[PDB]
Design a protein around this ligand. Structure first.
Ligand SMILES: CC(C)N1c2cc(Nc3nccc(-c4cncc5ccccc45)n3)ccc2N(C)C(=O)[C@H]1C
Length: 124
């Protein structure tokens, strides 16, 4: 029931190092990563482990912070907006699959609040 995880390396994809990407790794991702509610999001959803064969029938663009962290560390992105889009995919997937007030949604909402806080002053 688990698809192959999102790629974290792609040799023919063009890459750039920017100050915004460095901040997304050093500040934004590490602050989220340490948060008490981060653990569900530190790796792809394991639908076999969870016995949720429906998960990847609903969520067609999966994304997790373990993938985003590996992408940042491997210099996968062209620009910060591509990374921010991955974070937003992750949050949105959580809101789509689950229902308002679910524990997992409270977790995602807390992380997203912190995320928007940290990106409120991206560098230049
Ligand atoms: C809702 C839950 C199934 N959830 C989820 C689970 C995990 N991992 C995990 N591992 C062991 C036990 C559990 C677990 C069991 N029961 C209730 C829970 C309530 C709140 C958190 C976790 C729970 N969850 C990882 C990611 C997700 N994401 C992002 C989702 O959107 C859905 C698919």
């Amino acid at each position: 029931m688990n698809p192959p995880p999102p790629e974290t390396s792609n040799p023919n994809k063009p890459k750039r190092q920017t100050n915004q990407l460095q901040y997304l790794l050093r500040v934004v991702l590490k602050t989220l990563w340490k948060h008490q509610f981060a653990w569900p999001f530190q790796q792809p959803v394991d639908a076999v482990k969870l016995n949720l064969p429906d998960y990847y029938k609903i969520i067609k663009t999966p994304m997790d912070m373990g993938t985003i962290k590996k992408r940042l560390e491997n210099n996968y992105y062209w620009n910060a907006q591509e990374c921010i889009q991955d974070f937003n995919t992750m949050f949105t997937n959580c809101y789509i699959y689950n229902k308002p007030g679910d524990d997992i949604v409270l977790m995602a909402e807390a992380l997203e609040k912190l995320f928007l806080q940290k990106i409120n002053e991206l560098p230049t």
